[PDB]
Design a protein around this ligand. Sequence first.
Ligand SMILES: O=C(N/N=C/c1ccc[nH]1)c1cc(O)c(O)c(O)c1
Ligand SMILES: [Cl-]
Ligand SMILES: [Zn+2]
Length: 315
Amino acid sequence: EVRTIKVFTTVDNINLHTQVVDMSMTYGQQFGPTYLDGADVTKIKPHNSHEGKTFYVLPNDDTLRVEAFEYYHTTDPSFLGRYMSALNHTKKWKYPQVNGLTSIKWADNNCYLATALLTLQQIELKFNPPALQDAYYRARAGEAANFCALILAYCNKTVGELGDVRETMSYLFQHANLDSCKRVLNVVCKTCGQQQTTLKGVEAVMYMGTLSYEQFKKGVQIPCTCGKQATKYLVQQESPFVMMSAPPAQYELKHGTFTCASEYTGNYQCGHYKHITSKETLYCIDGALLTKSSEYKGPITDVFYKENSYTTTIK
Ligand SMILES: O=C(N/N=C/c1ccc[nH]1)c1cc(O)c(O)c(O)c1
Ligand SMILES: [Cl-]
Ligand SMILES: [Zn+2]
């Protein structure tokens, strides 16, 4: 007896492609690598309950290649497999609402993702790939599994791998529309004079070296090619936020002077992030956990600030 069922294949879970599969052969023998809501069914034969269901496959014809690129803005051949592998885990995570924001219950070293997700919900940012647009909308509503799996895939991190928040934000920002963002800096050395530089896009909203936006405006000390220490300060800023990052160090966060921040306790190869948000008071969100305080001091590694347009007064 020959037995078949109808299923649909997809790369973006929107555009469906009708298929007829032989129930005596595995999905892999018929489609190549195949996934059912994240689960790898490549070595599995069709079941009756599969009729009418949607399966992800790899982009193995030109139609799927175009659909995949338009949705994800990547042509990495291993992307869909990494996204599905992550999703099979992230769909089992829990996403509690904590102080009005979608968080993530701790699992699989996902603290860096929780902090990143909580941060995104407090800054003005639009994603460019439809995959991220669609999944971020769902994440804001509380169903963040597909968004978290996409972050992992885009960042080339597997579930359980230790992650860095600054690096993760850099990747997400690279897939965001920051074309309107502009930064002008000036650098003064007593021996070499001045040099002004203009930064755009991701480099216009991120800085590595100090956590304090105010000190960035007053001036920070850096090396120069001659051997002297030069001073760098912010001349002009056009962006809806800025992100200031530094190696973790004890730092005091004062209510009302920042938007949110990331706290890291541990060492290079192992640690834990928490999220601090400045609202009516200071709330510390640690996955599902919530505490509050009027003051905060801790090992801070990233601080986010509101912005619109800033121009210096330094002459
Ligand atoms: O993140 C930064 N660049 N990102 C690059 C990238 C490519 C793909 C993913 N990320 C970055 C670079 C700098 O030179 C900074 O001075 C800085 O603050 C940030
Ligand atoms: Cl978006
Ligand atoms: Zn110099």
